[PDB]
Amino acid sequence: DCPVRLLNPNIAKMKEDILYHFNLTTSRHNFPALFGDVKFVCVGGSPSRMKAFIRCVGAELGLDCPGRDYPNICAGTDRYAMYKVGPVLSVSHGMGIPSISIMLHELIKLLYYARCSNVTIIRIGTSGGIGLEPGTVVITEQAVDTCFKAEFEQIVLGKRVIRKTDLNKKLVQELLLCSAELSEFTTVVGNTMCTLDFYEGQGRLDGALCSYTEKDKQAYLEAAYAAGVRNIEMESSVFAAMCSACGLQAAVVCVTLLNRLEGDQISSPRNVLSEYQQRPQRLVSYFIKKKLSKA
Amino acid sequence: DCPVRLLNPNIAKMKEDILYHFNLTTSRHNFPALFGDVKFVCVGGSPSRMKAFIRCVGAELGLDCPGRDYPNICAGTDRYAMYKVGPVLSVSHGMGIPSISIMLHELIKLLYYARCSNVTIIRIGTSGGIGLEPGTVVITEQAVDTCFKAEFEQIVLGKRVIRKTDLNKKLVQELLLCSAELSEFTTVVGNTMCTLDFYEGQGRLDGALCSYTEKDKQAYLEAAYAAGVRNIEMESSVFAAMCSACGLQAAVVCVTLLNRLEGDQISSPRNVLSEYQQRPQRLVSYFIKKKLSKA
Ligand SMILES: [Mg+2]
Ligand SMILES: [Mg+2]
């Protein structure tokens, strides 16, 4: 009913398409039979996070078998692992806008070639919080830039193309519901600032280059807060932009590992951090299980 | 004589510094004894490229031993591997501006803590050529943006900071000399366009999103060419910017794998591609061996 769509007329005019970073191709792979049942896609930085994710969701669905399962489906690029169980796909996207951007182009084409429809896609991860306790889950309403605007700027053949970065409103409400229902941890909705850079792009004071003070950083974070920002990470903006353009229902669910208004490093004990790390996974696998119990 | 420098007053005011992505710290590691002899640093995308690099350079220097050597020095982040042989360091930086940017912040601090001076740093890699035969080596004069300008734009606490992206002129001349001396492959000097994005950022026609034609892409590439651009990759701009700011003598040496003025995919046979892949390594290890025979 909402099919995945490409916005590229050149594709229809091709002999074959190779998804270079997955080593999948239209000449060799039957996409509809492989991926046509896919309804939920979860994405995150590392293969180990996405592998823990698929094992959690498989157990929840009763699809967990005694053998050596959830094999990586794809190849050629270590940054990208892909796992599948029933209607769920779990894909790592690596670090930074360029790395997730390549993955999303090829993922969206995969899902298009598979004739997927009504696809929900959710990014999970960690983030620095602004004015929240360590361990709070943020469901992103808009993924904003360094001026706190809901816009992603892409340069296309030397020209600025501005795309909006709203997450899917209904999906946001559904995730918030799941969380209020679970009542296992503080969850808020807020905006998420997506930076390109970690040391200077986030107002950290420990870079090789820094032209500002603690006091300068605090003023900037206080302004981000007043503009609706609750957390900071590095992949959400391009994620949001491309997913709505191509007809995917997108959300971002990040846990905070610290409050940047109190300084730049993580105080929580190892055992505490490790329970925070599982929070986005907990919410999203619970949400998927709920959705597949009402289907 | 040219010491590595930090441009960060906050550092002097710290108890300890942790290089998070290398798992190295000032409280545990004696940086001057570990890295103070470092004069040459080669950087590239993948651990396997940088591991092939260090083994090539070690053999050239007579430092290659019969045992299981060039162990990865660092840990905690798969994207970053670090190898050392004599005064040479080889470091992988992963894919895209954000990933190399984190590595460079921590590398520059490492070299500063080690009290390194007269450090030459060189990025090796592959690229798409503009108006060059497949397999041509480009020594980058300036790493330019999507409008072909020698500038890198960084957002710092919401503000535009523009930094210049010239490579070190003298290093460029020295590398060109080594290449004319070797006479093993076509080498040019030219500008290198650094894009953030691969599918749309480079005018490719096979993205999930594409608002332009073959004819549009060609006009853009022809304009890049007329502005001095000879190749396209994804890490050189921030590399150039940060290295001159911090007192490193920087160069970029990329081989071209195709001519984008003839289309978007790589025609060369596997055996040919594999010999191209070694060209940047060949030039740079030869250059280092030359430098260490005149010391
Ligand atoms: Mg891309
Ligand atoms: Mg950085």
Residue numbers in the entry:
A (entry chain A), B (entry chain A): 16 to 310
Q: What do the study authors state?
A:
Uridine phosphorylase (UPP; EC 2.4.2.3) is a ubiquitous enzyme involved in pyrimidine salvage and maintenance of uridine homeostasis. It catalyzes the reversible phosphorolysis of uracil ribosides and analogous compounds to their respective nucleobases and ribose-1-phosphate. Humans possess two isoforms of UPP (hUPP1 & hUPP2) of which hUPP1 is more widely distributed, more abundantly expressed, and better characterized. hUPP1 has been a subject of interest to cancer researchers due to its role in the activation of pyrimidine nucleoside analogues used in chemotherapy, such as 5-fluorouracil (5-FU) and its prodrug, capecitabine. In contrast to expectations, hUPP1 is dimeric, having lost the higher order assembly (trimer-of-dimers) that results in hexameric rings in more primitive UPPs.
Specifically, one of the three pocket arginine residues (Arg64 in hUPP1) is bent away from the anion, leaving only two coordinating guanidinium groups, one from each subunit of the dimer, to bind the substrate. However, in the ligand-free structure of hUPP1 this residue is found to coordinate a sulfate ion from the crystallization liquor at a position 4.4 Å removed from the catalytic phosphate binding pocket. To this end, there are only subtle differences in the fold and residue orientation between overlaid monomers of hUPP1. However, there is a dramatic inter-domain motion between monomers leading to 3–5 Å changes in the relative positioning of the loops undergoing the greatest movement. Another implication of the loss of hexameric structure appears to be that the human enzyme possesses greater inter-domain flexibility than its microbial counterparts. However, the 'open' conformation of hUPP1 provides the opportunity to potentially develop a novel class of allosteric inhibitors of this enzyme that lock the protein in a functionally disabled form, with its catalytic residues too separated to lyse substrates.
